[PDB]
Symmetry: C3
Subunit: 331 residues, 3 copies
Amino acid sequence: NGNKLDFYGKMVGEHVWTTNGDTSSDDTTYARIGLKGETQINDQLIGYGQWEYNMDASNVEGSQTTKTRLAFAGLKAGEYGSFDYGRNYGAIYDVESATDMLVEWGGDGWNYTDNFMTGRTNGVATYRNSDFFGLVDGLSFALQYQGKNDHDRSIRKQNGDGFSTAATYAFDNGIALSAGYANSNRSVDQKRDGNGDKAEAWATSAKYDANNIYAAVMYSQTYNMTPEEDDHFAGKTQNFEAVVQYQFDFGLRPSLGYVQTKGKNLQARGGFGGGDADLVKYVELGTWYYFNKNMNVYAAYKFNQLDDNAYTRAAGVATDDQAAVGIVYQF
Amino acid sequence: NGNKLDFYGKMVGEHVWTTNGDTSSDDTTYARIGLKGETQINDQLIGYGQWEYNMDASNVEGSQTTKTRLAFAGLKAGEYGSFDYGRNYGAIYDVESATDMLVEWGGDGWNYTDNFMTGRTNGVATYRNSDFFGLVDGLSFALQYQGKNDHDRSIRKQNGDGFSTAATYAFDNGIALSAGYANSNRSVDQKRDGNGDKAEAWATSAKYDANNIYAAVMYSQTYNMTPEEDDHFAGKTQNFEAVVQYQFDFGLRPSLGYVQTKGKNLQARGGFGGGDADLVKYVELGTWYYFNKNMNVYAAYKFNQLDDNAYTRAAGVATDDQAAVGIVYQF
Amino acid sequence: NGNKLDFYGKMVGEHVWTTNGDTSSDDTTYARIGLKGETQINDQLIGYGQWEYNMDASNVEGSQTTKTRLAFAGLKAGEYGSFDYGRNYGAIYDVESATDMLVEWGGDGWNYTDNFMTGRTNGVATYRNSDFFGLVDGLSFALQYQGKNDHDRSIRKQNGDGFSTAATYAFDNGIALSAGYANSNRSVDQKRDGNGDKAEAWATSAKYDANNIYAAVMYSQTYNMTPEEDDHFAGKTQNFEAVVQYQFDFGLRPSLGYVQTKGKNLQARGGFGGGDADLVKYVELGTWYYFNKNMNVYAAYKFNQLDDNAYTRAAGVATDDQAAVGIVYQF
């Protein structure tokens, strides 16, 4: 009896509309199940593992994709910190997690899954340490290495060897500052574009979280990291996200969110001559109603502020507004 | 602890033969796991969720399909009724459930998965209410809306916007009557047939269930709803199913089942000139042996009464008899 | 009441290098979850089921395969023995299990998944009995039948009707002897090679397992059973495997493993004229470090002793060394 196992998951009945121009109306129901395991090895040492499995319930029974989102195991040793390996969130995502607190959208621009260390990815060894080796209360950090994923994927989702690091200072009153950087080799396949051999990003964030108020802001820049809808990589991006939300005691939680991603020095193709354009720009207005920890409902509206222009037409980016409603059983 | 979670599932070791003509002999082993969640939100209101996951164990490792059969969440508010949304059984299936109580086959004709609301489908908002708002004991009903699924599927599995409704009256002595109707728009892709722009069905059923006897009968008609093996839709269908079973005290439960589906005004193709033909016609003779709630074994034989004729050859329908044995662990 | 359910599984963070010639460096993280169900039917009789599900966490979220490795249900009646059906280990694998105790590799030569009854396969009815009907302590056996899998697979993974049997005698001091045989029809598709209509193997093994020492040895021969990397079948093979390991009190457990598979009378193709060649030949040197039952780490190195020669070039067999490290949470 030195072990703890914890099933968690959710059934999410959800539906999304596109309300302007290229209108559409789609089911996006899914279920998620995960497991969290923690074993007491010593008085000084803990071993742990996590997996998280997503199940599309949205396509017909022949064709529903499943995804293993997380899968890792690690040791954890008091103030010496922790170390895990497997499929995990990239460390620079710690910066973003403040502003990825939206109802339906959020972390669209700049953070993609299987995109170096901007979101969830394969083959990450991660070292963490909260309270800076016991020396500084509230200062945590993350160092992380990623091996190359170079052959059995689209060029869009490849990476060379690389690393990523994030620090977060959290003050007693409710503020937390947070900053992170990542540098990676690009894959031999990626380098054929002539855009450069390295891929980098840095990110900064602040959040306030006290008295039922939640506000967060986040700024970053990426270089040869962020993929466009075209499958070309943005040579330079400037990303800004921001969120404010309030929590009523009775379950209601309205939310206002802003998300922008400016591409700089973008390559020419088709109708798009130049090299400066918004990739993502939208406001999310939405709300949750929490009945209790186990049950909630939500709704949200995305005001998509991208224009129909030379870039959006050539790169095939959607300029239209969207809406989403959903109901969630949780455990 | 105002929450309840309930794992259910089964391992099903099963094997099926085709015994006439085009003989064959195939494994059809699978496992199924599901989860049922119910939270007490207050005295008046309950929240719930269900997910059900099927795992083919029948193909080689590398080619086994998984299916999320059910995934939904809903609220439930006493005699005001319940409301769920996600991937669920279509409401007109309530009519059929009486006669889909066979050993191996059953609900072949007329009910297909991802076929408007005849079986399990995507994007269904369903309202239910048992005992007709507290006014009529034993009278339950279901109203249900389905949004369009019109792009990322075969034409066979598409649907337009539509609705479906079922009522069931159940008497104290053991009889239950049941009736239901559905009307749907067809998809732009489906309408290329020239068959018509709407898809409809109605269904009626009765069952008797007392003194170790189980009998059920069911009649329906569908219009532009029921897919043929050819991927053409039957313009008009007349379906009749019937079942009788008896439960011996010692665990044995023999079953006799009849299932027929007549196509009317069928389009011509290949060898098939005319437009009148049986799509399904078979007798199932089979039995279960229940060891206890958790374990049973079963066997069944399908006498396939379709002839080798112009229709069956052109549409590629199987005319051959089948047999099936299986063992089930259940929880 | 008279039912028992048992979740087991593991998260495995793991990474593999190819260190010679065609170098590579790949993540091979996965999670596994399984369930073991046992119901008491009466004093004399037990019903059971098992399912085991593997989840690749190694590819990108679009493309991760899952596998149902085991899925069966059976009855068990004291000394009368047990009987299960579904997807299970083939009975002749009982012989191999002694020598498939390596860190990363092991049971490469001769045992393939979905290869008659050499590993995990579909449609196996298996009868088992330990202690030979209560008469001989430590003598167990397995008889097993497999139906044909003949149409919706690669020729490599097909089988005709067949059977397989294994016996194991285990002495109280720590030795166990073990022997087994299998005969199968080949599929109509397999027989096109002209190699013969039947597929057979026999296998013998011994193991010692006491006083922190583990040694095992294993010899077999197969005929028209074992697939080459070319998708031709080896008309005759001679397989030898051997393993020694020691368990230190501190958690460390080094392992030395040897695995060879000689092909005899191999068909000519490409550069390869003759008909005698090694298919598999390697030494594994590796170690575990067990923190406790729930958590371990390991590393291993595969010295691949196959030469670059006429066979390896024509059949496309990899001659290169490999290495592997990993961490495991287990329950």
